[PDB]
Amino acid sequence: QSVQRDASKGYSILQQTKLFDNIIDLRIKLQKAVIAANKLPLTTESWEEAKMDDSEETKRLLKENEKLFNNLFNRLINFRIKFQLGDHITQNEEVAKHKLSKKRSLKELYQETNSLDSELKEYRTAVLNKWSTKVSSASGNAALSNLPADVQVENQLSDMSRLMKRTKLNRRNITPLYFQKDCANGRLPELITENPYVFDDEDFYRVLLNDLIDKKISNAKASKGRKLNYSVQDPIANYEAPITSGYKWSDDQIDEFFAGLLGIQIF
Amino acid sequence: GISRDSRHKRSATGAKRAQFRKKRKFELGRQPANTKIGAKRIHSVRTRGGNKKYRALRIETGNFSWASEGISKKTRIAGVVYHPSNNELVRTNTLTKAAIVQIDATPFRQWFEAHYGQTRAASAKIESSVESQFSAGRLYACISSRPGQSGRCDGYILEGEELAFYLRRL
Amino acid sequence: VSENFLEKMMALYVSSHYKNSPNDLQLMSDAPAHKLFVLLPPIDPKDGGRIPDPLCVIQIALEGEISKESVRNSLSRGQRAGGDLIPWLISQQFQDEEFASLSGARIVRIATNPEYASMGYGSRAIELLRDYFEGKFTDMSEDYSIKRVSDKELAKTNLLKDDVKLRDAKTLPPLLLKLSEQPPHYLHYLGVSYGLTQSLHKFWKNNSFVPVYLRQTANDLTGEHTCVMLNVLEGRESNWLVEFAKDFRKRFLSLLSYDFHKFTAVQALSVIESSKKAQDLSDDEKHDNKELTRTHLDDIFSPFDLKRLDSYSNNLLDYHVIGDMIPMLALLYFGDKMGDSVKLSSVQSAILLAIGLQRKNIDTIAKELNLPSNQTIAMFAKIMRKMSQYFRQLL
Amino acid sequence: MSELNALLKDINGSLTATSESLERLSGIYSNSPAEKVSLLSLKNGSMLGYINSLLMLIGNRLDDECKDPSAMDARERSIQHRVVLERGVKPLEKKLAYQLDKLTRAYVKMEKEYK
Amino acid sequence: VSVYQVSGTNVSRSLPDWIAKKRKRQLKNDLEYQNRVELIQDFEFSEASNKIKVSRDGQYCMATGTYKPQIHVYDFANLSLKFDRHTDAENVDFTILSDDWTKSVHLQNDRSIQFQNKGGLHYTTRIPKFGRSLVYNKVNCDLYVGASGNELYRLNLEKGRFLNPFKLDTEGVNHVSINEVNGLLAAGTETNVVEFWDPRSRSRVSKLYLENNIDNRPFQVTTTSFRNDGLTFACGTSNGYSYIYDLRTSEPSIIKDQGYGFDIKKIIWLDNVGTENKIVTCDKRIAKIWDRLDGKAYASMEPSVDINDIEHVPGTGMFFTANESIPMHTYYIPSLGPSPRWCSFLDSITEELEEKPVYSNYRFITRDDVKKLNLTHLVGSRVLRAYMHGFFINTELYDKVSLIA
């Protein structure tokens, strides 16, 4: 019985790991979008001038862009409700079910995201504290009593200023459309190479690509003798004599090894 | 110790003939030469009379003839692909007469593009299968010279019914 | 059910031992430090919970955590308190007070099924045991104390009407506990003690243990010299171990003449090799060997001596002529002063170690390595040629 | 072609491709008592939020108005999610990595035995 | 590490040996010709050599030739050819039954087993179908012959009787090998499976399916070999991948890539030499030495001519290799162990020896395979160090791109 629960736990472990890899595939597909977005204009005047170049086609493209975007992010939010529901991250099952049923607007969609991240933060605090204690006890760190993981996350989130700069770093050297015209016109207050407007997660993106890559590596007729004649053959008779010693291993051992070859409450 | 004497065989009637005389020189046979693809290695043989024979123990190059255009070029042999007598000769890349081998297509392609200026049209037309082989980069040819005896491995590129039949057999 | 298992444990525990005494049973049962660890084959659910057989039985004794006051008072008094063998000995041999404070466990005994010796169960057993203390084993699913006989019960029972009974099964914990169920005790090192033999040392060496001490006087009953080997678990300071290992190696080299001349050349060479592996353990460069300085070389050897070595490298000398200087060469090479320029094969190292340190004759090593005497001297000659060429490079 | 039109096409392809893969992923999760590892559950859930925050960074930019071109709010959420994966989740699972591998191996052996 | 070529051709790979014989008369004046040392006289065949083995006693060696197909036997105690003996057809494999050279069995290529006794050809028998390998079971005196067909033939030397042939599930046996400790027979089938058999009974203890993740291509088991420890087991594939298996568990403990994509021709276990954890996996072009535990390369032998067989003199650091060249090469890696007793003074001349030394360290890739892997964009980069007609990549980086591709 103990075997089965462990085996089932592995399936959940595998399922979560497969779930991890799949979502990275989503991130990989989205990668050309984030680079493209960082190339988009930053200001109303640039966008209108961007539309000015091809007004008709851009309007059609913009209409398709808005539809696909809203459909996608409405769908993602549906998964998050289900995902955080299915995994017990959200405790209010009734509220989660109504949200899935109801269709939401863009303003409404942002609100659920705020709600969803808020719930994950509470779950995050509980989970890290639970496992950090468990790891501590296992290693004897409890006996010793190296910061708690939740505390470490709190400190890094406290240093929000440092890490914002990490995003602002323009490693790829992306120039958004009409960036020079917005700079010359003083339409970019933040700036007045590190660009606040360009977002760079390339290092984070590469590390995810590597980890996915390494895991894949780690897991990965009678004539001419054509009919056999069983007669005695004199010249080869008694050609060599068998050794009386036999196999150096004892027979029972040899029999044993072959069998396994190729693979009070006591417990 | 190989012999070609007809005495050790049985008669037509089935009688087991007795040994008349010890083995003689004029009834000699020598060990076979298992020609293989590899750096040209030839061992000479002093045969009956002043004549001489060359054994092609290893060889990589041969003269091959395109009969349709009546041309001959020296080409490298890539490997044995099919051999009518036995297939374990096909496996070990053993080279012998009638073997079907794959030869490099470069010089024939060069000659063709030179002579006809194509990669007028009617003459330049060639069999579709041969053209596909050119696109592949290797051509199917049949060895027509006995490597064991003369020491060379010349042959001809397959074509027509030859080519259809052997491609089917492949 | 427990008793059936205890008999199986003693069978494995007693099999290897030459002559076991019944004290050790009391020793296992009552000692608070001692713990017992059993490797078991995979359990088949079809077996209906039959009392399984033990393949490898390990007994560990927790030791250390000695106050820096007590060690000094005892060391000056020269008195050895009972227990804590490895701390007290290593404290004496090195006069280090910091080691006695560290928390460690001595592997009192390891035994495997003799029918199954030499197939990797014993090694597997140690590998898990280290992982148990290191902290790898954790429970993922989100008490084992037994209530003692209360004083109230003792007063309410009379000698005549005492009903002495086995403890009720609900009270008793399970016989076998999964590693994750029981937390470990925090430890810095794991130590062993065993008579030095080629097989055993090869086993310990493969398990990443490091020698730190070797008793000079062979045990009378066995003819073997007691050896102590230490290992440091991941995540703990490793400096103190490395200093001992370096210090021991120097001690071993000089003593090869005195009382370890008996050891086979290969056997002795292994001991140095095992200790050197400790150096590779420390990826730091704070402690490194120092190459021979030109001033140091002049004090060790006179220029004529270097010339004399040079002549031998050119074959213009008899072998006996250079007999004087070899032992000094041996210490410099095995002290690693010579540096990266001079490196030798295993056969050459054994030959040099023999003549230089064991003080054995060339003829004896020719037998001991089963080589012709002529080939031995030749291989020796190439060694001097490398050393001579090096001394030329320094100059 | 305008630079925007080529870019807008690039986004259009991604959003379609991402949506279809999401549709596949939602089906398999919907297809799935089995209890999951909470730490890994957070790990998946957190990085899901990271993608959402990235999309809000895309969404903020895609707007022609561009009231928040820096996408500071979307940045902070991506910042919050990224930290948990790198600083919190990763050290713990490395400690737990040994026991994880043992269990997954155990099932695969049983699954091999069953077949 | 230092590898010395005691004997063997020392010309360019492009230069064939026979011209060196023609150059030999012209270069007689050259001093190096006088100084060069040949260890065994006539240690050479007319055109090529097929197999090489050393008698158990340690004083005699035997070899086979291409034309005229012949059988040298070398006497180490005299550093000389003892006798050459011609045959009817070229050799495919043989074994030396006796401890000395006197007693041997040779499986030719015309499907005939010839029993060579000391005097001369004793008896010639024929197996039903073509043979590919030959092993001898000292315990039962039963000689086992691999065959193109499924059935694995059995010949009993004691009884002088063909016995019931074993029946394999698949057709084609490329190599057979008998574990000394246990008697387990391993049969290397053409398909990617190795079938184990019990000799005392006649059964199939189990079949191991070889799985390579890197390359989806089909591969054939070409060689097998049991270590004296009686537990570990080695396999070769036609894709140039050498596996080390602990028999008990189905998973491959280590997979090492030779990287030239050539079939593995022999595996030798260097346990006897000391520092037991080493192994040799010999290819058509390279014989690499590496350690069984870590997989790190120890030494490599890179002869100028194709390797057909390699042999290790027990208890010593010497290696013989039968090549497609006129001379058979002899190597000597001093680090492994002492020179053999008969080569007592080989150490003396080490400096005069050639001392031959990237190619073993990295994985070789053809131009076409680069296209298959979409690595064209890196051509000219420091990752791709081009040699000959192909490009070298780090083995780890090769594993990465292949799975992605």
For residue D97, what is the nearest residue in chain C, using CA coordinates?
C136
The tokens 């059609």 sit on which residue?
A: A60
Q: How far is D72 from chain A (nearest CA, A)?
A: 9
Task: For chain D, give the number of residues.
Answer: 115
Q: How far apart are CA C35 and CA C60, in angstroms?
A: 5
Taking contacts as CB-CB distances below 8 angstroms, the residues of chain E near B31 are 67-69, 86-90
Residue C370 φ then ψ, to 5°: 55, 45
* One domain for residues B86 and B68: yes
* β-pairing verdict for E131-137 and E121-126: unpaired
Q: Is the dihedral of CA D101, D106, D107, D111 positive or negative?
A: positive
Taking residue A159's Cβ as centre, other Cβ atoms within 10 Å add up to: 10
- Compute the radius of gyration of chain E from its Cα atoms: 22
Distance CA D93, CA A129 (A): 13
Compute the CA torsion angle B49, B50, B56, B57 (nearest 10 deg): 70
Dist. CA C268–CA C245, nearest whole Å: 15
CA of E170, closest CA in chain A: separation in Å?
19
CB within 8 Å: C382 and E337: no
**Contact check, Cβ <8 Å, A254/E183:** yes
CB-based contacts of E278-285 (< 8 A; 24+ apart in sequence): E278/E336, E279/E234, E279/E242, E279/E244, E280/E310, E280/E312, E281/E234, E281/E236, E281/E242, E281/E256, E282/E307, E282/E309, E282/E310, E282/E321, E283/E240, E283/E258, E283/E307, E284/E260, E285/E260
Contacts of E126 in chain A (CB under 8 A): 224-225
Per the document, the length of chain B is 170
Q: What tokens were used for B99?
A: 């073997």
* Euclidean distance between CA atoms E370 and E377, whole angstroms: 10
**In terms of domains, do B100 and B23 share one?**
no
- Give D114 to chain A, closest Cα distance, Å: 12
Q: Which of D85, D107, D108, D115 to mutate to test the interface with A (most CBs of A within 10 A)?
A: D107
Name the method of structure determination.
cryo-EM
Q: Which of E179, E124, E180, E186 is nearest to E155 (CA)?
A: E124
Instruction: Give me the residues of D, 66-95, that contact A with CB < 8 A.
Output: 66, 69-71, 75-80, 82-84, 86-89, 91-92, 95
DSSP code of E44? B
CB nearest to D22's CB, from A12, A26, A46 = A26
Q: Is C121 annotated as a binding residue?
A: yes
Interface present between A and B (3 or more CB pairs within 8 Å): no
Task: Report the distance separating Cα A126 and Cα A137, nearest Å.
Answer: 17
Number of H helices, E strands in chain B: 5, 11
CA distance B111 to B61: 18
Check whether C110 is labelled as a binding-site residue. yes
Both B35 and B96 in one domain: the answer is yes
Which pair of structure tokens corresponds to residue A203?
């290092």
Candidates C375, C380, C384, C389: best to mutate against E (most CBs of E within 10 A) is C375
Contacts of residue E373, Cβ cutoff 8 Å, sequence gap at least 6: E365, E401, E402, E405
Q: How many helices (H) and strands (E) does chain E have?
A: 4, 32
The one-character DSSP state at E29 is: G
Cα torsion C95, C97, C101, C107 to 10°: value is 0
Rounded CA separation C34/C89 (Å): 19
Supply the DSSP symbol for E349: G
Annotated binding-site residue? C29 = no
Q: Percentage helix, strand, coil, to 5, in chain D?
A: 85, 0, 15
Cα torsion angle, A179, A185, A188, A192, sign: positive
Instruction: List the one residue out of C351, C344, C335 whose CA is nearest residue C296.
Output: C335
| D76-114 b/e (C-beta count within 10 Å ≥ 16 → b) | bbbbbbbbbbeebbeebbebbeebbeebbeebeebeeee
As separate numbers, helices (DSSP H) first and strands (DSSP E) second, chain C gives 16, 6
d(CA C351, CA C354): 5
- Please give the helix or strand (H or E) that residue E142 lies within, else none: strand E142-147
Give the C-alpha distances (Å, rounded to integers) separating C14 from C17, C24, C34, C58, C193: 5, 10, 17, 12, 17
Q: Considering CB atoms only, which of C136, C138, C142 is closest to D38?
A: C142
E contact chains, 3+ CB pairs < 8 A: A, B, C
Q: In this structure, are B70 and B50 located in the same domain?
A: yes
How distant, in Å, are the alpha carbons of B61, C44, E126, E244 from that of E268? Answer: 35, 38, 29, 12
Specify the pairing of strand C103-112 against strand C189-195: parallel
Burial degree of E174 (CB within 10 A; 0-12, 13-18, 19+): buried
Find the distance separating the first CA and the last CA of chain D, reported in whole Å: 58
- CA atoms of C190 and C187, how far apart (whole Å): 8
Please report where in the chains the tokens 């568990």 appear, as a residue.
Answer: E249
Do B21 and B45 belong to one domain?
A: no
> Phi-psi region for residue D53, left (φ > 0), alpha (ψ -120 to 50) or beta?
alpha
**Letter for the amino acid at E91?**
N
Nearest to A240 among E141, E165, E196 (CB): E141
Chain E closest-CA separation from residue C117 CA (Å): 13
∠ CA E47-E48-E51, nearest 5°, is 155
* Residue D67 one-letter amino acid: K
Cβ pair B123, B94 in contact under 8 A: no
**For residue C372, which residues of chain E lie inside 8 Å, CB to CB?**
341, 344
Distance from CA of C281 to the nearest CA of D (A): 21
Q: Report yes or no: C253 and C335 within 8 Å, Cβ to Cβ.
A: yes
List all residues of chain A from 77 to 116 with a beta carbon under 8 Å from chain D. 78-80, 82-84, 86-87, 89, 110, 113, 116
Residues 6+ apart with CB under 8 A from C133: A140, C105, C184, C185, C187, C190, C233
The CB-based long-range contact list for C178-184 (8 Å cut-off, 24+ gap) reads C179/C128, C179/C132, C179/C137, C180/A138, C180/C137, C180/C138, C180/C139, C180/C140, C180/D99, C181/C139, C181/C144, C182/C144, C183/A137, C183/A138, C183/A140, C183/A142, C183/A143, C184/A138, C184/A139, C184/A140, C184/C132, C184/C133, C184/C135
The CA distance from E147 to E160, in Å, is 20
Whether residue B42 sits in one domain with residue B17: no
Which residue has tokens 């006995």? Answer: B146
Q: Looking at CA atoms only, how far is residue D99 from chain C in angstroms?
A: 6
Residue D37 DSSP SS3? coil
Same structural domain, B36 and B71: yes
User: Where do the DSSP E strands lie in E258-317?
Assistant: 266-269, 279-282, 287-290, 297-301, 307-312
> Is B74 in the same domain as B15?
no
How many of the other CB atoms lie within 10 Å of CB of E342? 18
Handedness of CA B76, B81, B82, B85 (dihedral sign): positive
Interface C:D, Cβ pairs < 8 A: 16
Say how far apart CA C22 and CA C27 lie, in whole Å.
9
CA distance C90 to D43: 47
- State the DSSP code for C16: H
CA distance A119 to A77: 14
| Interatomic CA distance for residues E17 and E11, integer angstroms | 8
Measured CA to CA, the distance from residue A240 to residue E117 in angstroms comes to 12
Place of tokens 């291409």: E66
Q: Are residues C138 and D99, on separate chains, in Cβ contact within 8 Å?
A: yes
Residue C211: which of C254, C287, C274 has the closest Cα? C274
> Considering only CB atoms, which chain D residues are within 8 Å of A38?
61
* CA–CA dist D100, D36 (Å, integer): 12
Q: Are residues B82 and B38 in the same domain?
A: yes
From residue A263, alpha-carbon distances to C56, E245, E254 in Å are 20, 12, 17
CB contact under 8 A, E97 and A249: no
How far apart, in whole angstroms, are the C-alpha atoms of residue C317 and residue C309?
A: 9
3-state secondary structure of C231: strand
Q: Resolution, in Å, please?
A: 3.7
**3-state SS, residue C104:** strand
Here the tokens at position C131 are: 């992982």
Cis before residue E68, ω within 30 degrees of 0?
yes
- Report how far Cα A93 is from the mean position of its chain's Cα atoms: 26
B-chain residues near E46 (CB < 8 A): 43
CA distance A264 to chain D (A): 27
Cα E214 to chain center, whole Å?
Answer: 24
Shared-domain flag, residues B58 and B89: yes
Q: Fill in the amino acid letter for E223.
A: T
Same domain, B38 and B75: yes
Sheet strands (E) in A96-220: none
Q: Are residues E86 and B1, on separate chains, in Cβ contact within 8 Å?
A: yes
Interchain CB distance below 8 Å, D37 and C140: yes
The Cα C356–Cα C261 span in angstroms is: 11
* Residue B151 near residue B54, CB atoms below 8 Å: yes
- Domain hosting B2: range is 1-30
Instruction: Specify whether B76 is located in the same domain as B157.
Output: yes
- C335 marked ligand binding residue: no
Element (H, E) at C274: helix C265-281
Say if residue C366 carries a ligand binding annotation. no
Under 8 Å between Cβ of A237 and E157: no
Cβ atoms within 10 Å of C280's Cβ, excluding its own: 8
C350 inside 8 A of chain E by CB:
no
Mutate to test the interface with B, among E66, E190, E326 (most CBs of B within 10 A): E66
